[PDB]
From a paper:
In order to identify novel CARF effectors, we used Foldseek18 to search for proteins with structural homology to CARF domain of the Cam1 effector. This method rendered a 600-residue protein containing an N-terminal CARF domain followed by a linker region and a C-terminal adenosine deaminase (ADA) domain, with accession number HAJ98955.1 from an unknown Bacteriodales bacterium (hereafter named CRISPR-associated deaminase, CRISPR-associated adenosine deaminase 1 [Cad1]), for which homologs were already identified in a previous bioinformatic screen. cad1 is located immediately downstream the cas10-csm genes of a type III-A CRISPR locus. Further analysis of cad1 homologs showed that over 70% associate in genomes containing type III systems (mostly belonging to the A and B subtypes) and exist within many unique phyla of bacteria. These data suggest that Cad1 is a widespread effector in type III CRISPR-Cas systems. Altogether, these data demonstrate that Cad1 deaminates ATP molecules to ITP through the formation of an hexameric complex that requires a Mg+2 or Mn+2 cofactor and an activating cA4 or cA6 ligand. While the triggering of a growth arrest in the host is a common strategy of all CARF effectors, we believe that Cad1 introduces a new mode of defense for CRISPR-Cas systems that couples nucleotide deamination activity to a sequence-specific, RNA-guided adaptive immune response.
Next, we used X-ray crystallography to elucidate the molecular details of cOA interactions with Cad1’s CARF domain. We first solved the crystal structure of apo-Cad1-CARF-His6 at 3.6 Å resolution. The structure showed an asymmetric unit composed of a tetramer formed by crystal packing between two Cad1-CARF-His6 dimers in which monomers are arranged in a pseudo-2-fold symmetry. Consistent with these results, SECMALS analysis of Cad1-CARF-His6 showed the formation a stable dimer in solution. Analysis of the electrostatic potential revealed the presence of a positively charged pocket that harbors both K104 residues on top of the C-terminal legs (residues 104–117) on each of the CARF monomers at the dimeric interface. Although both cOA ligands were fully accommodated in the electropositive pocket of apo Cad1-CARF-His6, they affected differently the angle between the two C-terminal legs of the CARF monomers. While cA6 binding produced a minor change (from 58° in the apo structure to 55°), cA4 binding opened this angle to 76°, most likely a consequence of the deep burial of cA4 within the pocket.
Numbering used by the authors:
A (entry chain C): 1 to 166
B (entry chain A): 2 to 166
The structure:
Amino acid sequence: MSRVLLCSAGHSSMVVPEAFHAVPEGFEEVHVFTTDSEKFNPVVLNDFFHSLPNVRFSITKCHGLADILNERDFEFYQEMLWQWYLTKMPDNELPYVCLSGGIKSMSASLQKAATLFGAQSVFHVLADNNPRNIEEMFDALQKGQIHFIEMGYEPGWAALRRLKKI
Amino acid sequence: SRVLLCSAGHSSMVVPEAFHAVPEGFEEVHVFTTDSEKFNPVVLNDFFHSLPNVRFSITKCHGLADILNERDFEFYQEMLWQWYLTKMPDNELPYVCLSGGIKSMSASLQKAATLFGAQSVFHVLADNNPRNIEEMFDALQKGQIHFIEMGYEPGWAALRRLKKI
C-alpha cells in the first residue's frame, strides 16, 4: 500500500520539499499539480527527488493555463484539478494532501476534492522565515522551525471515487 | 438578513471588495481577525462609516497575534467556529468570503461553512491589489475585480443546534 502525496505548487516550488518531510515515515508517490506558468521552477524539485529515487515522482502541467484570473479560468482549473485528483489517488488508500502551494483559489478547490474524494490527512505546512533553497529548508528543519498543521481525516465518498472508471 | 462573514489579516481591502461583489449589498458585516499589529482596521472602518445603513462588527482574537504551530491554529479554529455560529443568522445562511487572512485561516473558515451552512462560499479576486478606496472603486469601475463563487454549502441543522450549548 502506497502513501501518496498530492500537492499544488506555484512560483514558490519549495513547498513540496517541505511537505515530504512533514510526515516522518516518508512517502512513496509524490504528485504535483501546477499551472503551465513559466514562473514554475521544475529544477528545484528535480534535484531533490533525484536523491530519493525510491519515490515515484511526477509533475502534471495544465497546458494552456498560467494565471487563474477570472471565473472561466477557475471553472477550467477546478475541473482539471478534480480529474487529476481521482487518477493519482491510490486505489486501496486515501492520499495525503498538502494545501500550501499556489494561490488561495487553487488551495480552496483542493480542500473540496479531499472532502469529496477522501484524504488520509489533509494538512497545511507553515514556516518561520520561508526557506528559499534546499540548505535553508534543511537547516531550518534542523532548528525546529517548520510546524505541520493537520486539519483532519476526510472520509470522502466511495461512490464519487468510482468516477475514475468513467 | 444577508450576512457577510470574512477572515481578515494584513491586506484589509478584501472586505470592501467582498461587499461590492454581491450586487444588492449586505445589511450585516462581521470580521474575525487576530490581535495583530499589522491589521489596519482604519481603512475598513472609514469605508464602513460612509455606509451608515449597515451593521459592522470586527471581533479581535484577544491574545493571538499570529498562528505559528499546531496549538495556535486549534485556538484559532475553535474561536472561529463559535464566531461563525455566533454571527450566523437564525433563519438564513451567511455569505462567506475566503479572501483575507492566511491559508489556514481560509481553509478553516471553509470547513466552518460546510459544517454549519453558507449561502455562498465565495472568494474575491482582483488584478492590481487595490491599496485604498479610490483605487478599488476605480478597479470595480474598469471591470477588474472578480467575484469567484465556489458553491452553496447546505450545512447540517444537527450541527447548527450546537449553538444552544
